[PDB]
Symmetry: D2
Subunit: 501 residues, 4 copies
């Protein structure tokens, strides 16, 4: 039984061995990276069902990101399985500054009046919190009285009660006991700081990633189509037009501009972490269901992200609410589920991937009964999509073990995936860029093969590659689609129902 829901696993120090030590043992950052022992840990995540690795450029310099990517290339050869490479941009982050005295945090009590400095390049005091704003912007004129400054996952609340025009400080009232640590995430909901459509830092991170070799870019805090189009222009300019863009929807503007963002992007990452601080937390499930339905209707990819197995950062078993979240993401229609801290920073990265895969594989068997997606309502807007509808109809009419598409660009695999057939989809393609580019599409098993000649029987090929990969055996029924014959067919034009020999 193959996992149809794809897993994005964030890499980090959790899987990295340094001079024979695990993450957190003292002196770990003293030692050098053991590339081979790190690659063996990553290979186990691949074997357990990670389909794509996320390189979070919020954390770690270009040297760290570049070595981690090179480590995954070894892991793929140990696992005998390729994975997608996804770069996630820093974007317009605000962080608390370093503290004076090297005193790494202070604790505060409800009611207690302090100040937030807008002035950049300074250090924090306990009385006056300083912010590291992306691109060193001045945020003073953008934040009115009665907004909230939220530190570390919205855990510590600061109410802006007055502004000191003379020092450009917010006069803030602590709303609840809590810590302000150095370098923690800050959110200020319901404000419109003029961050550029694409900051220089993100331009540089993307160009670096494109040079290493990536398949996907997840763009943090996408507010408009313009934030996607500016990254598109760089991919185009550098000969990386094959790279797919996922817009991260994590604030109100992104939700408000969702339709134009979906049209410009290849896919959406539902970035629930920031989204649930930036909009009312109880609205996130409403927006999750609505985004998955819209992205599927567009024939594009949706990733559900953040806190999916959060408890597994510290414990070997997830909570009942975490298992419920992963299961309900699948039923809602998600193409992919994601791990952040659980695979990057936690004690149980392999078990986190294994647990998510178990949940995902169980949930896919209930899509027939409880699935929210309804392919019956779609307009079939092309002949390939007409063939994708007919494939879904065959897999509803009888027990089909596997759909096989011979796909030059993956267009036929994406359309079949959009219809969510009751079968795995083997996408036989003729280059590695197309192969890796399909790795986050629901149900698609990408596989590299030789371009078939005008004299080759593609139905025989389809069956032999399915049997070689161990996906079918004697007596199984499969559906095969292709453009026949090669050199004359302009598109996928043929469906065959075949019993494996």
């Amino acid at each position: 039984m193959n996992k149809r829901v794809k897993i994005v696993a964030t890499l980090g120090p959790a899987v990295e061995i340094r001079g024979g030590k695990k993450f957190g043992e003292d002196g770990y950052w003293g030692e050098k990276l053991d590339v081979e022992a790190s690659a063996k840990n990553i290979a186990k995540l691949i074997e357990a069902g990670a389909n794509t690795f996320r390189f979070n450029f919020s954390h770690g310099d270009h040297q760290e990101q570049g070595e981690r990517m090179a480590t995954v290339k070894l892991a793929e050869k140990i696992a005998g399985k390729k994975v997608g490479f996804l770069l996630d941009t820093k974007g317009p982050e605000i962080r608390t500054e370093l503290f004076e005295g090297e005193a790494k945090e202070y604790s505060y009590k409800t009611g207690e009046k302090i100040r937030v400095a807008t002035k950049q390049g300074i250090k924090s005091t306990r009385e006056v919190i300083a912010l590291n704003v992306a691109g060193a912007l001045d945020i003073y004129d953008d934040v009115e009285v009665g907004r909230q400054v939220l530190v570390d996952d919205g855990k510590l609340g600061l109410r802006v009660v007055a502004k000191d025009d003379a020092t450009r400080e917010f006069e803030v009232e602590v709303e609840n006991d809590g810590i302000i640590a150095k370098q923690k995430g800050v959110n200020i909901p319901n404000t419109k700081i003029p961050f550029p459509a694409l900051a220089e830092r993100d331009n540089d991170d993307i160009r670096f990633g494109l040079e290493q070799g990536i398949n996907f870019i997840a763009i943090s805090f996408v507010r408009t189509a313009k934030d996607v189009n500016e990254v598109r222009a760089i991919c185009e300019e550098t000969g990386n037009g094959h790279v797919q863009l996922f817009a991260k929807i994590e604030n109100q503007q992104g939700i408000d501009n969702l339709d134009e963002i979906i049209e410009a992007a290849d896919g959406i990452m539902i970035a629930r972490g920031d989204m649930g601080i930036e909009v009312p937390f109880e609205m996130v499930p409403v927006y999750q269901k609505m985004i998955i339905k819209k992205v599927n209707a567009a024939g594009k990819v949706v990733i559900t992200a953040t806190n999916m197995l959060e408890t597994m950062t510290e414990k070997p078993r997830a909570t009942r609410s975490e298992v419920s979240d992963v299961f309900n993401a699948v039923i809602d229609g998600t193409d992919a589920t994601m791990l952040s801290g659980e695979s990057a920073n936690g004690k149980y990265p392999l078990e986190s991937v294994t647990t998510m895969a178990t949940i995902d594989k169980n949930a896919q068997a209930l899509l027939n009964e409880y699935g929210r997606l309804d392919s019956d309502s779609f307009e079939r807007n092309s002949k390939t999509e007409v063939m994708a509808s007919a494939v879904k109809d065959a897999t509803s009419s009888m027990d089909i073990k596997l759909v096989v598409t011979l796909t030059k660009t993956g267009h036929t695999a994406r359309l079949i995936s959009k219809y969510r057939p009751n079968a795995d989809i083997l996408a036989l393609t003729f280059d590695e860029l197309t192969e890796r580019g399909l790795m986050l599409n629901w149900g698609v098993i990408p596989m590299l093969t030789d371009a078939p000649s005008s004299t080759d029987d593609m139905f025989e090929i389809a069956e032999r590659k399915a049997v070689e990969a161990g996906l079918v055996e004697s007596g199984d029924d499969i559906v095969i689609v292709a453009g026949v014959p090669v050199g004359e067919a302009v598109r996928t034009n043929t469906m065959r129902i075949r019993t494996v020999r």
Copy 2:
């Protein structure tokens, strides 16, 4: 635009020329048949949309039926289009006898006192009507005072007021003004006459038709599966197992046994004339809709019959009730609509076929809006039926001008027909008997062609035959299904969507 609902037309003197005279002209019957002039009249009915001719063996002898079948074979050569040949049996029925001195009929007024004889083997007079009871049964002890004897599909009622033991005659009162003609159907509701299992006359009639060459037998007053199986045994014994059997349901016993009759038969004829006298008339629309649904679910053929354009026997225009009836039969899901007196006996046989074709062609355009049949409900019970579902799905997803099937036995064409796709179905077949056997399946346009060899491109043949038939032109989209390749495929296994070159 092509007619998908098939037309059965009953042949009779209405279309026949005798010594230059038309049916109805003085001295008509004193002339002999003009075969060529009659064949040109029948060729016009073929051209207007008659798909099959009904030869009712309840009227006229073997020589008359045999010459009429020969006239139709000539009409096919004149029209350049083949039709089906359907034999309709007498069955376990009562008919009025020939009259003394070959008077054809008499007229009667309400209140006249006449007699009906039970003695077999004699002729009627105006005052004493004799019955031809199948099996030459004596029915005198089976009919009580107060029963009603109905002649000509219930057009004339005779009340049994007394019985004469001396002559074994019913003394009857004429209930309403009307005609008693020779060889007219007689119904005596609420009576149990013990008709034999298969009358000797039905045995002779079926063996004579099978010798002449027929494609269908319509079995009158089918009571049980055994009434079908007995005719099947004759078809198999004489080397005519290709012949298809339609059970006529026209009494309560046929309705009580419908399920076992459908399993034994190739189709049902809803014989509403007898049915609406033998069962409460107000139940016939209920039974019509339920029969159409069950036969379609079984992948078999249903023919709706009797009174469909009754007024056009005498007048050039149908009533509003008749147009409604033909329209609602199509919407109910009928494969075929029938003409009886309108084509066999009326003044407007060509206009009747033309009018029926016009109503049928309009009603097929309303099948998506109003159609009663629901193919989404069917179990797909075989790999050919899975392909038929997928074809229907293709015709629902985009504008398909034509479905082409390359079919050895017609099985693939019968299963595509069952699903009622939004397209015409070109059935390319390799023998005339399979070709004519498909002529009453909804939407099917049968065409004879050479059996493809293993080196032939069946998709090229399909398009070429469709373009040669004038069914499609450059730029139309067609669906083609075939068992690929010839000499290896077990069944239809391939669907191709093709733009006509």
Copy 3:
């Protein structure tokens, strides 16, 4: 079992006895009307299920119409049941003129060239057919070359090949053998003769009918809302605001303006006779289904008319197509079915009503399975309509024998009727005008009772009136709605489920 579909029966000479003779016996028009013997025949139609009588002012002068209406008032007291009184207007009829020589018709052959005179007040010749146009209009400039003049139910076709500007004659080619008799209906499709919105003759007929006492006006050839509003103004002006207007839809303009006509009228009569000559005959069933759905959605009354049991003009049993038409009108959603010639002019007026009632009563039992109307899709646009939806829900949830509404104006009965509950609707009302005005609403049994006082138990009343009328017995469950309490309630506000004692 009560008939929920209402019957409109046209009265005429068929039920009228003159000096002890039936219609058609020689000297019948010599004798005087036997009022009492005529009233006894009409009472039998009432008992057999006629709910409303149609007085067709196309045929018979004011004296004939006035005596027939007075005859029905006696019939109601013999039957012990009231009926609606419907006036049907002549409207813009064109008829063939009287012939010179008193020679009542001529027969014609295909190809034969003749002339149609537009000049009014003259007599017809065999060579030159003259027309009696409503209001003596000149139709010459309105009819182009290549229109068709159709005589007697579209039976004889005349193609206009040229116009003689000098004599104002059409030069016409007979298209098919046929008779032109004196005073037959003429149609000229696809022309726009400027007949007034309301002719003086129709103004006079309506004022006469209003003076005798009518409940309904069916307005012939309604083209726009203006043709309904002009009759509305007369009903209002004369103190007859209670009179309900049915627009007859019988031509293309009426179909084109259907939405504005439904908004201005109380109901639609689908006048299929003219409609099927004025538009293509095969489109009439499409328009019938669409009109019934739209009129029901508006909460108004739809009557399906013409040819429903046509054969029963001359024979005691209807055809299978006639039974199918009446059954399918019921399933389509019609409130009422109508008889014209069958009850007015035929040999079997009582049996025609009885047959139609039998068909209607059988069909209502299949509305659950096959009914085209869908009340689930309606907007509930008021609190009374919300109560009508809840009543329908109760009758779907359990077996309810009867809904009882205490209704001052009938508004609650019409809304409950609109939802088509699975029960009869007893409408207890407090005046005869409201009572008769409900007689064509699906399922409504109108019954006159005393206005309940603020101290009366309306639920006890509802049950006693149901038991007195023989509609329920001991152990039956009924739904009762009322405005409680009387004098305080502004509308129907209460639903009760009650077991009969």
Copy 4:
């Protein structure tokens, strides 16, 4: 706007003040309970939306449970709002023992070797954990080498590596860093311990609760209908047949016997903590959705429990997975959501109830869009249920602010709740036991009132009580149901739609 999904909150030390100290402060446990200060804390939970308090008899003795129930009775008087009292039994379970020297817990590191004792009636030490096995069973021979002993809802794993016959001790290896605290649940998957039919301790616990005054019993680890019927027998014997029984489903035997457990019980608690260790964790979402559907179909109460806001035990904000879990439980169709450690043991008990109330209130607004429950599918099995269907239909047809039922036993309110109308349900009842018994039914706001006399207007009382409760104001539309009149009606038989004066 009112919360329709009910909240069960587990009470514990988190809300209790002891000698002026809060839970967590130094010397807390050296103080005695401050009853009034604790009652004010609990009153805040009632005000935030706690509808019922859970007293878990697996923790603390009779005196502690008895005083806590007394503190809640005071909290009700302070809040001016009544709550439900639910007793949660030990059942056939294993718990960790008290520690020697009333240490409350110890911390353990991965790889530590410790022992688990099987001997009953002793205390734990850090190195030797003792079990309290219901029925004082010896489990030494029931647990093989290689089994896993899990403590605290699977937070800490112990691998059985060897068995010591000399002490009847399991030698175990600590699988992961964690705490072993006193009276924590112990699970040993894939083991068959023969627990008795009803432990003596459950008998004493149930009889003590029934003496104190409770409304609900939640029966832990219900295996069969007999586990419910044994508690029912005690409730009936002691004169407490009003008490409602929720079966907790938390093992495979409870799932295998679900149908017979639902028929025996008044409700189900989906006890996901134990369930997700006793059955594959990935099956718990499948069982949750199926249990919710079956219990709703039975017109009974379903409570979703455990880990719903787990992170808010320690942090002021829930994860995205937790908000999703609460949201999806509401959408699945749950009557009620539960807090355990969040309210009993955490730092943010008030904020947990507030957060749950906010998610629940938002999710109820999405029930028409996304709701899994389908009331259209139910058989209406009684005249009260027919009225509940009609109420739901009224709330679907227009904007109803409130449904008021005048209900002696709560039956009408339970059936309206079952149908999930788009409105709040005010249940006016005449005794406190019926009033508190309705506190966990979806949408029901119970309120005590005088039994109407035969001279009272129940529709006036309904509106007045609703306006006095502040649930509606002038101009709102309400539906009221009642058995009219008092002293004659058998059941609810009347629905009124009323505009509030």
